[PDB]
Paper text:
Stx2a holotoxin is a ribosome-inactivating protein (RIP), which belongs to a family of AB5 toxins, consisting of a monomeric A subunit (Stx2A) and a pentameric B subunit (Stx2B). The catalytic A1 subunit of Stx2a (Stx2A1) interacts with the ribosomal P-stalk for loading onto the ribosome and depurination of the sarcin–ricin loop, which halts protein synthesis. The P-stalk is composed of five P-proteins, namely uL10 protein (former name P0) forming the base of the stalk, and two P1–P2 heterodimers, each binding to uL10 (9, 10). Stx2A1 (15, 16) as well as other RIPs bind to the conserved CTDs, with a prominent role of the CTDs from the P1 proteins.
Here, the state-of-the-art instrumentation and multiple software processing platforms were used to determine a 4.1 Å cryo-EM structure of the 72 kDa Stx2a in complex with the ribosomal P-stalk, with local resolutions in the range of 3.5 to 7.5 Å. Stx2A, denoted as chain A, is composed of two fragments, namely a catalytic Stx2A1 fragment consisting of the N-glycosidase active site and the P-stalk CTD-binding site, and Stx2A2 composed of an α-helix, which inserts into the channel formed by a pentameric ring of Stx2B. The structure reveals the presence of a density associated with Stx2a in the region identified earlier as the binding site for the CTD. This density can be fitted with the C-terminal six amino acids from a single P-protein of the P-stalk, denoted as chain P. The cryo-EM structure unveils that the six amino-acid peptide (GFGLFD) from the CTD interacts with Stx2a. The CTD-binding pocket is located on the opposite side of the Stx2a surface than the active site, and it is formed by α-helices: A, F, I, and loop 1 spanning residues Pro27–Ser39. The binding interface involves Stx2a residues previously implicated in the P11 binding by the X-ray structure and mutational analysis, such as Asn18, Thr35, Thr36, Ser229, Leu232, and the conserved Arg172, Arg176, and Arg179. Importantly, the cryo-EM structure reveals novel previously unidentified amino acids, involved in binding to the CTD, namely Gln10, Gln11, and Val14. The density representing the CTD in the cryo-EM structure can also be fitted with the six amino-acid peptide adopting an α-helical, rather than a random-coil conformation, as observed in the X-ray structure. The cryo-EM structure reveals a part of this loop spanning residues Cys241–His243 and Ser256–Cys260. The structure shows that Tyr77, located in the N-glycosidase active site, is occluded by Stx2A2.
Author numbering:
A (entry chain E), D (entry chain F), E (entry chain B), F (entry chain C): 1 to 70
B (entry chain A): 1 to 242, 258 to 297
C (entry chain P): 6 to 11
G (entry chain D): 1 to 57, 59 to 70
The structure:
């Protein structure tokens, strides 16, 4: 279920208005653009994050994320 | 000035470390939990540095005890290392201003920057294993090794030695979580990501601490404190403010909702601009 | 007798 | 009567502009995306969120929220 | 012609896309969206705020707000 | 060359949303909206601001506002 | 091959909607404005950031990596 969980420390924004996140050695990409402020806030704020998807294939994209204090 | 660190036993190492802080740092009344209390480095003249001999690594008998580390007091940064057997001194490239007269100073190409050390080590700062035999091997390599740069083996040597010295003094977790490594079992220490994050944010944590008034909820960058015990065990030494501390932000600490928020942490994600215009369409 | 703190 | 109040422990994002929050163990989802960014302020600042509602049955669109502290 | 001065400890987003702010024990309402990304910041920073409007009578809306650090 | 290099005090945001900032005793009016949070973040953190112009009297043209980390 | 890497030690902005950073000895500028909160928040906390452009040899940049180390 949960594709991955933990901390975020690396991610790339591409020329095509897409953003990819590095977690657990598995890059999750998405064209969604309204979550970048949330992602940067969580990354710099020490906010644990985890991404869940029905299909979490190798490098599966990220569109269903949730937070965690610890 | 002259000092010595003993790795022979848990009590010896802890006592030496406490001696170092007591003779270096002054306890803080605002943070004063009886005997245990965080301390602030006493202001020192520029260019000063103390000297610590490495001892207790070879507990079986007196041997492998010809290494000294010279470290400034201004910002608690490793300055240089002296081989007493060869009576020679090597200085970090970025520490050229800091020199030790009376010993054969020798330039070292490598600098003291954390990024350079991690790169030469080519290993993440979290996860290294430090053991007595590995420590002895690194010691012997450095003693026999010399020149103008530290090799990859010298890279492990230097990273392992700086890890057990800088954050060990700065933070109370390493000494607490490294004393067992001296035990009969002597478990091999592993550098956890949380300790890494605490080490990276030493400057801002130290800038935040002085205005602490026994608060409970502290929030500075990746670091958060929810209990007095965690605050006590996180950091034991902080930088000096008089006016190097004031570089970014008029005040770094905000006491709101019985919580101490770092100013940078709040301001970082508090910059949302007009963003719904995109969703309005063409 | 260093307790859990040490 | 009040039914949901507490510190957010689970916030979930859906591609259909619906964002769900767990308060008092009750899941309430809001479709109006305008409030999606604002909750972030209470997300990290520990501002406990309390939601007004005629009845305590959950799963309905929530837009009447208040932020306080303990 | 300042209507109110001081600090705000809670603010409402009414369901008709109206945002109301509590200052020195009185509520003033508006509908200017640009305030949410900024006024909420004041809520978390002790940022002194004052209000000027044509009519300060109870329940009157607010359009001009002056922010002072103090 | 620098009209005013000092900490920004505040700005007036009238009903027309005119951003009449004033720093170091000099009042300069601008009509941009995306700089509101950027400038409020600088204000709350004590961040300094430098403004340049050929004519540095209040009410004159402006072409360079910035913040100086050093 | 990096156009720039480090921190925002000093930056500049212009009313023509272009923002730039004085890094690596050059005033690397860009005309886009969809990423303004990202780098400003990054420098606010001093966390490291690197930026690439169409080429990393006086142009605009649109791709940024950010790390907390």
């Amino acid at each position: 279920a949960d594709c991955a969980k933990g901390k975020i420390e690396f991610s790339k924004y591409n020329e095509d208005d897409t953003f990819t996140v590095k977690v657990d050695g598995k890059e999750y990409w998405t064209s969604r653009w309204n979550l970048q402020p949330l992602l940067q806030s969580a990354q710099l704020t020490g906010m644990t994050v985890t991404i869940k998807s029905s299909t979490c294939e190798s490098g599966s994209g990220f569109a269903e994320v949730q937070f965690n204090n610890d | 000035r002259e000092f010595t660190i003993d790795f022979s036993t848990q009590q010896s190492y802890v006592s030496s470390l406490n001696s170092i802080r007591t003779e270096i740092s002054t306890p803080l009344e605002h943070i004063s939990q009886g005997t245990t209390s965080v301390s602030v480095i006493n202001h020192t003249p520029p260019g000063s540095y103390f000297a610590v001999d490495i001892r207790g690594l070879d507990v079986y008998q007196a041997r492998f005890d010809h290494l000294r580390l010279i470290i400034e007091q201004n910002n608690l940064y490793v300055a240089g290392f002296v081989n007493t057997a060869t009576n020679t001194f090597y200085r970090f490239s970025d520490f050229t201003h800091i020199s030790v007269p009376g010993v054969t100073t020798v330039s070292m190409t490598t600098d003291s920057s954390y990024t350079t050390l991690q790169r030469v080590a080519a290993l993440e700062r979290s996860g290294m294993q430090i053991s007595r035999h590995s420590l002895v091997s690194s010691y012997l390599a450095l003693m026999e090794f010399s020149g103008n740069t530290m090799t990859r083996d010298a890279s492990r040597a230097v990273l392992r030695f700086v890890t057990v010295t800088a954050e060990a003094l700065r933070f109370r977790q390493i000494q607490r979580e490294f004393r067992q490594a001296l035990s009969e079992t002597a478990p091999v220490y592993t550098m956890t990501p949380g300790d890494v994050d605490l080490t990276l944010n030493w400057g801002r944590i130290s800038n935040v601490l002085p205005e602490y008034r026994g608060e409970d909820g502290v929030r500075v960058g990746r670091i958060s404190f929810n209990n007095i015990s965690a605050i006590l065990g996180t950091v034991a030494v902080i930088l000096n403010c008089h006016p190097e501390c004031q570089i970014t932000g008029d005040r770094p600490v905000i006491k709101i909702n019985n919580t101490l928020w770092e100013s940078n942490t709040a301001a970082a994600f508090l910059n949302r601009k007009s963003q719904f215009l995109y969703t309005t369409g063409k | 007798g260093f307790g859990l703190f040490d």
